[model samples]
Target: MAKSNNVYVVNGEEKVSTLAEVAKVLGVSRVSKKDVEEGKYDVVVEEAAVSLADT
Candidate 1:
């Protein structure tokens, strides 16, 4: 898997925010945003760079 420092702002409209929210759509534990931001989790998404708004 490729390592990245990118954040995926999930579409809250399509999905949910909290673990319970995500669980309602998909049965899974809610992933903490802090974890991903803190580099505690590895993220991998197609065309991920497009989502980045470079300053």
Candidate 2:
């Protein structure tokens, strides 16, 4: 699987996948701030587990 600096935790297991990966698991073609706000996607989302590079 492709790796991303992005990180997430699902079902108590740390997932080192990108937002794209999470969106895939959520069965959505994409994720957006608006979608996140609506909370209608019916998926569990979390903040990245680790801080990204400051660059």
Candidate 3:
């Protein structure tokens, strides 16, 4: 599925762009699928903040 919002929380503090956008912010070509799969970034995912107890 395609993601709508490009916004993501970095360590529950800073608001930055998407996974691909993170690479762009760092002057990179793209953020690899492996990088995202490996949990390289501490992103909150989607609609996760609403339910705090863990889904």
Q: Which candidate comes out best when scored by TM-score?
A: 3
- Candidate lDDT scores, in order, read 0.34, 0.43, 0.45
- Expressed as tens digits, the lDDT of each residue in 29-53 for candidate 3 is 7664444567664344554241122
Q: Residue by residue across 4-24, what tens digits does model 1's lDDT show?
A: 543243433232223233333
Candidate achieving higher TM-score, 1 or 2: 2
**Ordered list by lDDT, greatest first:** 3, 2, 1
Going through the candidates in the order shown, the clash numbers are: 0, 0, 0
Please give the range of 10 consecutive residues that has the lowest summed lDDT in model 1: 13-22
**Regions more than 4 Å wrong, model 2:** 1-18, 42-55
Angstrom error of the Cα, residue 46, model 1: value is 9.8
Candidate 2 lands at a TM-score of 0.35
- Which consecutive 10 residues in model 2 have the weakest lDDT in total? 46-55
Candidate achieving the largest lDDT: 3
> What is candidate 2's lDDT per residue for 6-43, written digit by digit as tens?
34432244454544445666676765434435754433
Clashing pairs in 2: none
